[PDB]
């Protein structure tokens, strides 16, 4: 499939990804990484992703969050869940079974697989802050480990979040790498080690 475009644009209404502040205890079921622009995160546990803009966008703008390989020799590749956990009933009722991101907690959610490209991806209403909160959080969930066999096989991804109108015209887009493991905290903390020394 066609390779959709990860670069960083803020955009006319300057969108911008915002994280929680976590560290690396063992225990931790999701952390970011500021300095590798990267989450930690364990199969099927919440991720928060913050939707920060300086101008409010018009109504009708969506967000969409899709995940690509990272590496240049597998970006061609459709994301997909494995096999194993495809079939396991797992579906929280909407989701289809075979899609990795899923988003909890929102009853406007919609599960796109692409009719050309086959590409899989979630997209709910963007919403903006409520009274006394200056941004938006979204509740992502990745249904695989990056080690699933017949699924992400090792492969690092990224997640986009793409604001866009209606009909699809791109508004922004960011994006984070992801790795699901069984340990985020030690994981974050391995690969953070190894990139200070
Ligand atoms: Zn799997």
């Given at each position: ?16 990804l ?15 990484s500021p300095?590798?622009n990267?989450?930690?995160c ?6 928060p992703?913050?939707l920060?803009?300086?101008?409010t966008?018009?109504?009708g703008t969506?967000?969409?969050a899709?995940?690509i390989?990272?590496?240049?020799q597998h ?11 495809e079939?396991?009933s797992?579906?929280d009722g909407?989701?289809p079974?075979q899609?990795?991101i ?18 899989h991806?979630?997209?709910v ?17 990745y249904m ?7 699924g992400?096989?090792?492969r ?6 793409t604001?866009?109108?209606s009909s ?8 984070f790498?992801?790795?699901?493991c069984?340990?985020p905290?030690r ?5 953070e080690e190894?990139?200070?020394?």
């Amino acid at each position: 499939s066609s390779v959709p475009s990860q670069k960083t644009y803020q955009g006319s209404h300057g969108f911008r990804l915002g994280f929680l502040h976590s560290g690396t205890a063992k225990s931790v079921t999701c952390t970011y990484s500021p300095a590798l622009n990267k989450m930690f995160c364990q199969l099927a546990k919440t991720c928060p992703v913050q939707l920060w803009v300086d101008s409010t966008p018009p109504p009708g703008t969506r967000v969409r969050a899709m995940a690509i390989y990272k590496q240049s020799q597998h970006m061609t590749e459709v994301v997909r869940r494995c096999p194993h956990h495809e079939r396991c009933s797992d579906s929280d009722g909407l989701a289809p079974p075979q899609h990795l991101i899923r988003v909890e907690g929102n009853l406007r959610v919609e599960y796109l697989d692409d009719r050309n490209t086959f590409r899989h991806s979630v997209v709910v209403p963007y919403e903006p802050p409520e009274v006394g909160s200056d941004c938006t959080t979204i509740h992502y969930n990745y249904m695989c480990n990056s080690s699933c066999m017949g699924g992400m096989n090792r492969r690092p991804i990224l997640t986009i979040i793409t604001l866009e109108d209606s009909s699809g015209n791109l508004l922004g887009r960011n994006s984070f790498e992801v790795r699901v493991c069984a340990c985020p905290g030690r994981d974050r903390r391995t690969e953070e080690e190894n990139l200070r020394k």
